[PDB]
C-alpha cells in the first residue's frame, strides 16, 4: 500500500509536467516556439557558447543573461541571453550556425552586427545575437 502511494504522487506529478509542456507544444498561430525538453542546465549553455565562439575565432566581448519572461508562457519562464562577439562575417555566420546546431535549447532570434571601427581602417564586425532558453515556471 505505502509504496504504491509513492507511485501515485510520482506519476500525478509527471502528469502535471506533461500538461505543462504537451499543451504548450500544441500551441497555435501566434508566436510559435521551438520544442521544449527540460534542459535545466544554464552554465553549460554559457560555457558551450564560449567554446563555439572560441573555435569560430571570435572575441567574446560580452555575454549578458536576461530576466525570465514571467508573462512569456504559462508553463515556462524564458531566460534570454544576449551575446556580443566580434570578428569576420564568415566567423559570425559560423558562430550562429554552430549555436543553431547545438544539443541545447538556445533558440537564436533577433540578430544584429555592424563595423566596430570608427575611422574604418580595417575590417571588423561587432555582432550582437539574442538567444534564449526556456526554463520551467
Amino acid at each position: 500500500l505505502d509504496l504504491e502511494l509513492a507511485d501515485k504522487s510520482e506519476i500525478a506529478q509527471n502528469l502535471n509536467e506533461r500538461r505543462r509542456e504537451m499543451d504548450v507544444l500544441e500551441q497555435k498561430l501566434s508566436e510559435a516556439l521551438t520544442e521544449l525538453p527540460e534542459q535545466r542546465d544554464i552554465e553549460e549553455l554559457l560555457a558551450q557558447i564560449n567554446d563555439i565562439g572560441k573555435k569560430s575565432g571570435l572575441e567574446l566581448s560580452s555575454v549578458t543573461p536576461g530576466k525570465e519572461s514571467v508573462g512569456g508562457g504559462e508553463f515556462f519562464a524564458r531566460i534570454p541571453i544576449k551575446m556580443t562577439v566580434s570578428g569576420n562575417y564568415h566567423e559570425i555566420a559560423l558562430f550562429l550556425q554552430e549555436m543553431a546546431n547545438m544539443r541545447r535549447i538556445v533558440n537564436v532570434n533577433n540578430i544584429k552586427f555592424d563595423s566596430a571601427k570608427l575611422k574604418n581602417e580595417k575590417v571588423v564586425l561587432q555582432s550582437e545575437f539574442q538567444a534564449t532558453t526556456f526554463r520551467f515556471v
Binding site: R18, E21, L25, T34, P37, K112, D114, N120, K122, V123
Partner: protein
C-alpha cells in the same frame, strides 16, 4: 492495494503515452518553424508593383556612380543575406577615404535610410569570391528590424557597397 496499483498503472500509461508524443510534436514543429522561415524567405522587405523582380528578394535603394553601386536593402535572416553576400564577394577593406557624400548622408541631405552606415571609397583585398564580376567591399551593416504592435517586418535590414567589373 490492488485498486491504487491499477490507478498507477493507468496514470503511468498516460505519462508514457505522453512522453513519447512530445518528442515528435517537438520535432515536427521545429520543422514547421524552419518552413515558416521558408515562406517568409521568398518574400519581401519593400513594397513594389513589379511582374518579375531582378533580384532574388526585394531590397530598398540602389545608387550607382559607374564605378561602384552603393545599395540599401533587407533580407529574411542571417541566411538569405548570407546567400546574397556569398553570391558576390568578401573583402578585407583597409584605408578608407572620407568624402562629402558621407556627411550629406549624415546631413540627411541625400535621401536614404539612415539605418545605414555611410561611405563608398576605400581599398579592397579579396577574402572570398563567387562572382568573378563583382568586388563587394563588405556587408557594411545589418540590423534585424522587429516592428511593433502596428505591424511586422522582423527581417534583417542591411547595407552593402560593391564595385563590379567592366
Amino acid at each position: 492495494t490492488k485498486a491504487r496499483i491499477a490507478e498507477l498503472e493507468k496514470i503511468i500509461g498516460e505519462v508514457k503515452n505522453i512522453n513519447t508524443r512530445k518528442a515528435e510534436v517537438e520535432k515536427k514543429l521545429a520543422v514547421l518553424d524552419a518552413l515558416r522561415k521558408g515562406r517568409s524567405g521568398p518574400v519581401r522587405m519593400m513594397d513594389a508593383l513589379a511582374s518579375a523582380t531582378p533580384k532574388k528578394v526585394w531590397v530598398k535603394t540602389f545608387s550607382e556612380n559607374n564605378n561602384a553601386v552603393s545599395i540599401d536593402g533587407s533580407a529574411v535572416s542571417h541566411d538569405e543575406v548570407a546567400e546574397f553576400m556569398r553570391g558576390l564577394n568578401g573583402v578585407v577593406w583597409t584605408p578608407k577615404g572620407m568624402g562629402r557624400l558621407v556627411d550629406r548622408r549624415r546631413d540627411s541631405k541625400t535621401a536614404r535610410v539612415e539605418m545605414l552606415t555611410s561611405d563608398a571609397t576605400i581599398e579592397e583585398f579579396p577574402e572570398a569570391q563567387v562572382s568573378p564580376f563583382f568586388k563587394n567591399i563588405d556587408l557594411q551593416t545589418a540590423k534585424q528590424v522587429g516592428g511593433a504592435q502596428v505591424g511586422v517586418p522582423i527581417l534583417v535590414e542591411f547595407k552593402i557597397t560593391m564595385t563590379s567589373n567592366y
